[PDB]
Amino acid sequence: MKYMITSKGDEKSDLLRLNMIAGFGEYDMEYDDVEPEIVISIGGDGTFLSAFHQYEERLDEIAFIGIHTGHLGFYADWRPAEADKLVKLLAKGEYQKVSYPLLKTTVKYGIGKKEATYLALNESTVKSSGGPFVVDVVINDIHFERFRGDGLCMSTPSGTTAYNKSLGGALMHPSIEAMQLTEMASINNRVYRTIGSPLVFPKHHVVSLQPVNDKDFQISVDHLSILHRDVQEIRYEVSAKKIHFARFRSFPFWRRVHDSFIED
Amino acid sequence: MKYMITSKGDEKSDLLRLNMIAGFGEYDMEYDDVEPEIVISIGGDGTFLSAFHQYEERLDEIAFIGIHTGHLGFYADWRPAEADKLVKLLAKGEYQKVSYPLLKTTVKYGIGKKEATYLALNESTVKSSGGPFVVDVVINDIHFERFRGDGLCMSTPSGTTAYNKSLGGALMHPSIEAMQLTEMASINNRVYRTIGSPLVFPKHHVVSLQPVNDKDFQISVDHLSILHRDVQEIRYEVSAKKIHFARFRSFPFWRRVHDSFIED
Amino acid sequence: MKYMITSKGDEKSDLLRLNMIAGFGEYDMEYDDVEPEIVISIGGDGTFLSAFHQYEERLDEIAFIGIHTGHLGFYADWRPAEADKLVKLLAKGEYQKVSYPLLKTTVKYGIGKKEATYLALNESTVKSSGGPFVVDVVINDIHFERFRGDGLCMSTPSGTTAYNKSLGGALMHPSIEAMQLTEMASINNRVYRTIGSPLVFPKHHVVSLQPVNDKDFQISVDHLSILHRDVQEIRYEVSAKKIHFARFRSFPFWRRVHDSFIED
Amino acid sequence: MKYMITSKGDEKSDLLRLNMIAGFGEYDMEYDDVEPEIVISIGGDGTFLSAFHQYEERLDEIAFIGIHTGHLGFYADWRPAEADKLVKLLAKGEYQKVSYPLLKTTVKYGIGKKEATYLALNESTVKSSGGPFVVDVVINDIHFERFRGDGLCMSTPSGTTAYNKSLGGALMHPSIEAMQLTEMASINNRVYRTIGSPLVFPKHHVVSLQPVNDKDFQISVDHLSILHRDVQEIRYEVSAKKIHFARFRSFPFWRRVHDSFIED
Ligand SMILES: CCNC(=O)NC[C@H]1O[C@@H](n2c(C#CCN(C)C[C@H]3O[C@@H](n4cnc5c(N)ncnc54)[C@H](O)[C@@H]3O)nc3c(N)ncnc32)[C@H](O)[C@@H]1O
Ligand SMILES: CCNC(=O)NC[C@H]1O[C@@H](n2c(C#CCN(C)C[C@H]3O[C@@H](n4cnc5c(N)ncnc54)[C@H](O)[C@@H]3O)nc3c(N)ncnc32)[C@H](O)[C@@H]1O
Ligand SMILES: CCNC(=O)NC[C@H]1O[C@@H](n2c(C#CCN(C)C[C@H]3O[C@@H](n4cnc5c(N)ncnc54)[C@H](O)[C@@H]3O)nc3c(N)ncnc32)[C@H](O)[C@@H]1O
Ligand SMILES: CCNC(=O)NC[C@H]1O[C@@H](n2c(C#CCN(C)C[C@H]3O[C@@H](n4cnc5c(N)ncnc54)[C@H](O)[C@@H]3O)nc3c(N)ncnc32)[C@H](O)[C@@H]1O
């Protein structure tokens, strides 16, 4: 079917891309980067995240595949030595699709500057634009805590092995439709109090961050960081949208975790 | 309907129990501790856990209610001052039922000593019977890590605010059908390696602990600790069974967490 | 002797300052903010830190005193209700001096842009100027680790109850001449490895951070954050300089910690 | 001079011991395990700790050396391949001595059962003898916190890379005369509160644990675990005694840490 290939842009990834395009030319495979049905990412997880964001508006029409030309990337299923096998298997259509949950972030502004919405495959984080970070954390309209510290991170299940992990979060199997909120260096004393623990939320729960004094925030979505001014609310919820992977063999999540953090 | 009341056994809980029995006598409420349909626990969370284990074989026929005579217990919905209101509301049948997931622990032995199975509302933990604790951790038959340290804790969602929390685990909303594995003081050096992070598993995943040298273990299920000798395997999975609570008003989990850890 | 008083600048602190100046006028106390021998800070710990930095070049000639007009500040020994008692005790010279260690930070530049040195009472932190933070950590010329993550924090003993604490550091009695290095969200996987644990260094050990790719860093010293470009090295060591407090009664550090974090 | 050699007791360590004894016989070296002046440990850190405790009453007359026949032990300076070089260097007296601090634990009993004192090279820990662990923590007679949880660990500087590290403690250079207290799974909620952070104490500070209800405790000193009944007090302080190592070359502590936890 229609496919496209993104490359990290080093010599190794560019050459692999050109060789895969040549292999696909031996099948009924049209290169089409406007409306692909298969998106192959050649690089690392950053390359994969960029491919995801390039096609975030057609996620229900696309199956993603990642090839890692460096160390095993987490969203990668293939080493470069297997590209020819992948071309063949993709050509014949011999693959199941697996879906991972995504995170929706809504940023609301004052002075009628509307809403912006973002989709995350790894996480969305929030920090101050300089000066202390203080937000009220509201869970399904329940005032839960006032957070003072460096920032907050809201992770998808597949993101839990990324920034979330470094912040002390739990690793969550991606079949669980959830998001996980972790703290970045909260202050805790007789006067300031947060929960400390990571929090795991199901689908349909809404976590709202509400400014207390300063209204300017640096908001990251995967590796894109943007300054938002005059923020009234940041709202997190598990997205109704999902990312779909083409799978050709068993590579269970927990084996992926083992291979990335324990030994490989 | 049929009900019974357990008491922590101090003067305050015993007297409240007797007064509630008197109130129930003004309605079509039969006291029956063999086959109750409502089980009221008066005490703390330990009292509640004991009531759960007293009726673990009739969990699908019973709705539980907890009254806390000391500090707000986590499984408690009522203060003692509200007992009369509770009697009335229970008598009229004005209540919805909510269910929390449970944890199944299976202990397999050698020399054909069969299997023992246990159900946990908070968690199941494992430690050595003395001497170093070393187990292989096998996830759905995938060898994931060799754990060396003080022990491991596998928590239900409602247990995540208990021992799990003290071990660095995430707090998980109990609508999520999952179990969470946390480490107790793992050794990590150039030679010994564990994941460190808490792990959250969905229903149908099986986590098996397999002895490496010593085969004797202290296994806790809620607050019951038992020595198991000649263990071949400890297996954890989310149970098919659930605990049911009678609910008469809104007391959302996240508000319960706020009230217990942030301020109340 | 010569004294001056700094104020947070709210009505309460300004009025207390004016009343203390009036009280001091009844003694042989000259107000002198060029060469004070006693520096009184009225406000919070931020006010105290600012007073310290205002006189960092005369630290061996000055004894500091802090009054907290809000919640108990850590560098505060007095509540506002005790100001008159403090005026009297200071006037008569009835006080011992206690010293806390300080942290020296040296920033070296390329293209012969020399060195800048800074003194910290709480801590010095380093983050990237945007983009990933990666430094080699060199301890007494021994390459110890390559750190990749959000940043690093080097704390004095009295700073260990501040940012250091939120980052998981140990609280250290200030009689110990040491500095403590904590991590901010390090990445750890099969490929990237850091020590994880806080590190405590004695006097005369030098910890050098050396850029790997990007050479621009945001360096904080207490609450002053500065962008440094074209950095070749950041060097941390326990300073030869000390801060001196005037003490009029026993307020042991561990009681101060209890009162600030446990109960008061 | 007088020396002795302890062995882990496997074939490799026993044979190395016999070969070193043969080498020492070519010098003015008397084997004497009653009053040695050099104690060589061949094995791992457990073997070294046992050698330390075998001669804890002559610590000021002995210099210790460790050979690791397995993975690099932390108290080991030599690989087995270097034994012959070590024999030679020891024979000629070409070595400096370095000292590490030690931990004194005093256990006081009721019903006039006196005091027991213990010396630790790694740490002393305390847990309940079964049933909940609850102690008041008193620092220099100041009531600091009531600890409820699994236990407490008090570490020497060289012990900070051992159990202390797994409990989240700081790694401390052994030139610092200090002890470090870490928590094992403390309960923290609206009702129960501990400091959480590791605490680092200088020489001459005394940390006293005082029972609240149960008076029976399991107390570990290095790898020796003993049940103490009817305890009135456990007291920790940095010992006046030190352990002395024979050093023949530079192996800095921080390089030792790097080699054990980062890469080697
Ligand atoms: C230390 C700076 N970051 C990196 O070096 N990331 C590159 C590494 O991260 C792995 N990586 C990525 C990525 C990716 C592409 N990133 C450039 C963006 C992502 O950087 C994460 N992030 C940011 N601050 C972090 C911090 N202080 N600590 C840890 N992470 C941090 C955050 O999740 C963001 O989205 N995604 C996954 C995943 N889902 N599971 C496991 N590993 C994964 C990938 O293979 C490479 O090993
Ligand atoms: C420190 C010793 N334990 C206690 O003082 N527990 C009594 C406290 O625990 C609260 N509690 C209980 C209980 C209950 C009844 N327990 C006697 C048994 C339970 O003790 C837990 N546990 C054991 N080791 C622990 C440790 N080192 N650190 C933290 N916990 C530890 C473990 O989950 C076990 O099942 N269940 C919940 C819950 N699901 N969510 C929130 N709080 C809860 C309850 O209100 C009281 O505040
Ligand atoms: C959360 C933002 N910071 C604050 O709200 N600080 C204000 C609080 O901090 C207390 N405070 C101060 C201060 C002070 C004055 N600061 C404006 C500057 C100091 O903010 C520290 N810092 C920065 N990022 C932090 C983070 N993410 N988490 C924790 N701290 C963080 C850092 O050490 C810096 O120097 N010094 C001490 C001390 N030595 N021991 C105990 N408490 C102390 C003081 O009473 C007030 O309770
Ligand atoms: C996990 C069980 N313990 C072990 O496997 N210890 C054997 C390991 O420990 C290294 N080891 C030893 C030892 C030694 C000899 N031990 C049998 C006794 C010591 O076991 C420590 N301990 C107990 N519970 C622990 C836990 N849950 N987590 C981490 N440690 C734990 C505790 O400090 C005790 O004294 N001393 C040092 C040192 N000062 N610095 C660095 N590594 C060191 C040594 O090379 C081997 O790699």
Residue C184 sits at the chain A interface (C-beta within 8 Å): yes
The DSSP secondary structure of D35-47, one letter per residue, reads S-SEEEEEESHHH
Q: Give the H/E segment covering residue D254.
A: helix D253-261
Q: B159: annotated binding-site residue?
A: no
Nearest by CB to C190, from A186, A225, A261: name it.
Answer: A261
Of A72, A150, A189, which is closest to C260 when you measure between CB atoms? Answer: A189
User: In chain B, what residues touch A194 (CB-CB under 8 Å)?
Assistant: 262
CA distance C117 to C235: 9
**What domains appear along chain A, each with residue ranges and CATH number?**
1-101+241-263 (3.40.50.10330), 102-240 (2.60.200.30)
Query: In chain A, at which residue ranges do the beta strands (DSSP E only) sit?
Result: 2-7, 30-31, 38-43, 63-68, 96-109, 115-120, 123-128, 133-139, 142-155, 171-172, 178-186, 199-202, 207-211, 217-221, 224-228, 231-247
Q: Look at C197 and D171 and tell me if their CB atoms are within 8 Å.
A: yes
Distance (Å) from the C-alpha of residue A187 to the closest C-alpha of chain B?
A: 13
A163 C-alpha to center of ligand 1: Å?
Answer: 6
Residues contacting D17, CB < 8 A, separation 6+ = D5, D6, D7, D42
Selection from D46, D106, D39, D103 nearest residue D70 by Cα: D46
CA of A43 to the centre of ligand 1 (A): 14
Going by their DSSP bridges, the two strands C63-68 and C178-186 should be labelled as: unpaired
Please say whether the beta carbons of A123 and A161 come within 8 A.
no
Other Cβ atoms less than 10 A from the Cβ of C154: the count is 25
- B77 and B248 Cβ atoms separated by less than 8 Å: yes
Tell me the C-alpha distance between C144 and C98, whole Å.
Answer: 35
Pocket test for ligand 2, best of D127, D134, D187, D193 (most atoms within 8 A of CB): D187
Between CA D17 and CA D7 the distance in angstroms is 7
CA distance D149 to B130: 19
Q: How far apart are CA D40 and CA D4, in angstroms?
A: 6
C166–A187 CB contact, under 8 Å? yes
CB within 8 A of B152, min separation 6: which ones? B125, B126, B135, B137, B181, B182, B183, B184, B209
Q: Tell whether ligand 2 has an atom less than 6 A from the beta carbon of residue B73.
A: yes
Cα dihedral: D6, D12, D18, D20 (round 10): -80
Q: Quick one: tokens of C50?
A: 């600012």
Q: Distance between CA atoms of D118 and D56, rounded to whole angstroms?
A: 10
CB spacing of A187 vs C167 below 8 angstroms: no
Distance C50 CA to ligand 1 centre (A): 37
- A121 touches A243 (CB < 8 A): yes
d(CA C68, CA C159): 17
Question: Which residues on chain A are in Cβ contact (under 8 Å) with B255?
Answer: 142
| Contacting partners of chain C (3+ CB pairs under 8 A) | A, D
Both structure tokens of C57 = 């070049």
Determine the residue type at B190.
R
Q: Which residues contact A72 (CB under 8 A, 6 or more apart)?
A: A259, A260, A264, C190
* Token pair in block for residue B242: 């659930």
Task: Output the six-digit token pair for B230.
Answer: 């000649």
Candidates D100, D69, D101; CA nearest to D82 is: D69
Query: Whose Cα sits closest to atom 43 in ligand 2?
Result: B162
Q: Which amino acid is at A137?
A: V
Query: Is the Cβ of B196 closer than 8 Å to some Cβ of chain D?
Result: no
Amino acid symbol at C244 = H
H or E, element range at B99: strand B96-109
Half-sphere exposure of residue A162: CA atoms within 13 angstroms, side-chain side: 24
Tell me the two tokens of residue D246.
């024979």
Give CA torsion, residues A139, A141, A145, A151, to 10 deg. 60
Asked if residue C209 lies in contact with residue C201, where contact means CB atoms within 8 angstroms, the answer is: no
Q: Angle CA(C96)–CA(C102)–CA(C107) in degrees, nearest 5?
A: 160
Angle at B238 between CA A200 and CA B64, to 5 degrees: 85
What is the rounded CA–CA span in Å between residue B84 and residue B23? 7
Q: What is the Cα–Cα distance from A83 to A94, expressed in whole angstroms?
A: 15
Contact assessment for residue A125 and residue A222, using Cβ atoms and an 8 Å cutoff: no
Dihedral, CA of residue A256, residue A258, residue A260 and residue A262, to nearest 10: 180
The answer to whether D185 contacts chain B (CB < 8 Å) is yes
D220 lines ligand 4 (CB under 6 A): no
| Distance from C-alpha of A21 to C-alpha of B120, rounded to nearest angstrom | 55
Catalytic site positions of A: 45
- Chain C CB within 8 Å of residue A191 CB: yes
Distance CA(B41)–CA(B91), nearest Å, equals 17
Ligand 1, CB cutoff 6 Å, lining residues: A 44-46, 49, 73-74, 122-123, 158-159, 161-163, 166, 222-223; C 132, 148-150, 185, 187, 189
Q: Is there a contact between D167 and B185 if contact means CB atoms under 8 Å apart?
A: yes
* Tokens coding B110: 């050698």
3-state helix, strand, coil in chain A (%, to 5): 25, 45, 35
Instruction: Report d(CA B162, CA B125) in Å as an integer.
Output: 12
CB C192 within 8 A of CB C211: no
> In this structure, what token pair is assigned to residue A143?
């005032």
CA D90 to chain centre: 24
Experimental method: X-ray
How far C127 CA sits from the closest chain A CA (Å)? Answer: 12
The 8-class DSSP code of residue D51 comes to H
- Return the amino acid letter for C54: Q
Nearest ligand for residue B191 CA: 4
Question: Which residue's alpha carbon is nearest to atom 21 within ligand 4?
Answer: D163
Identify the DSSP state of A169. P
Beta bridge partners of B182: B153
Contact with chain C for residue D180, Cβ under 8 A: yes
Rounded CA separation D248/A191 (Å): 53
Contacts C264 to A, Cβ<8 Å: 190
CA distance D177 to chain B (A): 25
- The strand pairing partners of D241, in sequence order, are none
Task: Return all residues near D86 (Cβ < 8 A) that are at least 6 apart.
Answer: D20, D40, D65, D67, D78, D248
The half-sphere exposure of B245 on its side-chain side, counting CA atoms within 13 A, is: 25
- Report chain breaks in chain C, C–N > 2.5 Å, as residues after which they occur: none
Q: Which two tokens stand for residue D173?
A: 């250079």
CB–CB of B197 and A173 under 8 A? no
Burial of C204 (0-12, 13-18, 19+ CB in 10 A): exposed
A263 touches chain C (CB under 8 A): yes
β-pair type (B142-155, B133-139)? antiparallel
Report the interhelical angle of B11-24 vs B83-92 (nearest 10°): 30
Contact A142 B169 (CB under 8 A): no
Helix (H, G, I), strand (E, B) or coil at A58: helix
The Cβ of residue C134 has, within 10 Å, a number of other Cβ atoms equal to 16
Q: How far apart are CA D230 and CA D115, in angstroms?
A: 12
Beta bridge partners of A78: A67
Give the integer Cα–Cα distance in Å for D207 and D105.
10
- Residues B120/B241, Cβ–Cβ less than 8 Å: no
What would the two tokens of residue D5 be?
Answer: 């050699």
Dihedral angle, C-alpha A155, A159, A165, A170, nearest 10 °: 70
Active site residues of C: 45
What is the number of alpha carbons within 13 Å of residue A102 lying toward its C-beta? 22
D50 token code pair: 């046992």
Provide the token pair at C82.
Answer: 């005790």
**Rounded Cα distance, B173 and A155, in Å:** 15
Dihedral angle of Cα C124, C129, C134, C135, to the nearest 10 degrees: -40
The closest alpha carbon to D62, from D41, D80, D47, belongs to D41
Residue identified by tokens 């049933």 is: D131
Nearest Cβ partner for C170 among D139, D173, D200: D200
Closest residue, chain C, to A168 (C-alpha): C185
Q: What angle do CA D186, D234, D133 make, to 5 degrees?
A: 30
B136: left (phi over 0), alpha (psi -120 to 50) or beta: beta
Beta bridge partners of D173: none
CA distance A154 to A104: 10
Q: What is the CA radius of gyration of chain C?
A: 20
* CB-defined contacts C:D, below 8 A: 95
Please list, in sequence order, all residues whose beta carbon lies within 8 angstroms of the beta carbon of residue A49, skipping any fewer than 6 positions away. Answer: A75, A121, A122, A222, A223
What is the DSSP code (8-state) at residue D149? E
**Residue partners of B220: CB distance under 8 A and separation at least 6:** B123, B124, B125, B126, B127, B226
Count of Cβ atoms closer than 10 Å to residue C111 Cβ: 7
Going by C-alpha positions, the residue among D224, D254, D197 that lies closest to residue D123 is D224
Stated as kind and residue range, the H or E segment containing D84 is helix D83-92
Number of other CB atoms surrounding residue C193 within 10 Å: 18
DSSP code at position A49: H
What is the spatial distance between Cα A65 and Cα C213, in angstroms, rounded to a whole number? 30
Nearest to B171 among A143, A197, A252 (CB): A197
Ligand (nearest to CA of D131): 2
- Which residue in A103, A127, A129 sits closest to A209, CA to CA? A127
CA distance D160 to D176: 12
By the 10 Å C-beta count (0-12 exposed, 13-18 middle, 19+ buried), D111 is classed as exposed
In chain A, what is the straight-line distance between the N-terminal and C-terminal CA atoms, in Å?
34
Contact A184, B212 (CB under 8 A): no
Structure tokens at A116: 């912006």
The answer on whether B95 is annotated among ligand-binding residues is no
Contact call for residues D138 and D207 (beta carbons, < 8 A): yes
Distance, in Å, from the CA atom of A146 to the CA atom of A134, rounded to the nearest integer, reads 7
Within its chain, how far is the Cα of D68 from the centroid? 17
Binding site, annotated residues of D for NAD(+): 45-46, 122-123, 148, 150, 158, 161-166, 223
- Rounded to whole angstroms, how far apart are CA atoms C132 and C126? 12
Ligand sitting nearest the alpha carbon of C149: 1
The helix (H) or strand (E) run that includes residue A253 is helix A253-261
* Residue whose pair of structure tokens reads 């309605």 in the numeric block: B27
Closest CA to B161 of B100, B241, B243: B100
Annotated binding residue C188: no
* CB-nearest partner of A195 from B180, B201, B257: B257
Check D33, D45, D141, D264 and give the catalytic one: D45
Report the neighbours of D using a cutoff of 3 or more CB pairs below 8 angstroms.
Answer: B, C
The answer, for B9 touching chain A at a CB cutoff of 8 Å, is no
Q: Residue B185 corresponds to which tokens in the numbers above?
A: 């003081």
Residues whose CB is less than 8 angstroms from the CB of residue A205 and which lie 6 or more positions away in sequence, other chains included:
A139, A140, A237, A238, B173
First-to-last CA distance in chain B? 34
What CA–CA distance (Å, rounded) separates B130 from B105?
A: 21
Residue burial C25-50, b: 16+ Cβ < 10 Å; e: rest:
eeeebeeeeeebebbbbbbbbebbbb
Quick one: three-class SS letters along chain C?
Answer: CEEEEEECCCHHHHHHHHHHHHHHCCCCCEECCCCCCEEEEEECHHHHHHHHHHCHHHHHHCEEEEEECCCCCCCCCECHHHHHHHHHHHHHCCCEEEEEEEEEEEEEECCCCCEEEEEECCEEEEEECCCCEEEEEEECCEEEEEEEEEEEEEECCHHHHCHHHHCCCCEECCCCCEEEEEEEEECCCCCCCCCCCCEEEECCCCEEEEECCCCCEEEEECCEEEEECCEEEEEEEEEEEEEEEEECCCCCHHHHHHHHHCCC
Say yes or no: B260 contacts chain D, CB-CB below 8 A: yes
State both tokens at D254.
């921080």
Which helix (H) or strand (E) covers residue B118, if one does? Answer: strand B115-120
Element (H, E) at B20: helix B11-24
Closest CA in chain C for residue D162: C197
Cα distance between the two ends of chain C:
34
What's the one-letter identity of residue B214? Answer: D
**Residue C190 zone, left/alpha/beta (φ > 0; ψ -120 to 50; rest):** alpha
State if residue C238 touches ligand 3 by the CB under 6 angstroms criterion: no
CA nearest A144: which of B168, B249, B259?
B259
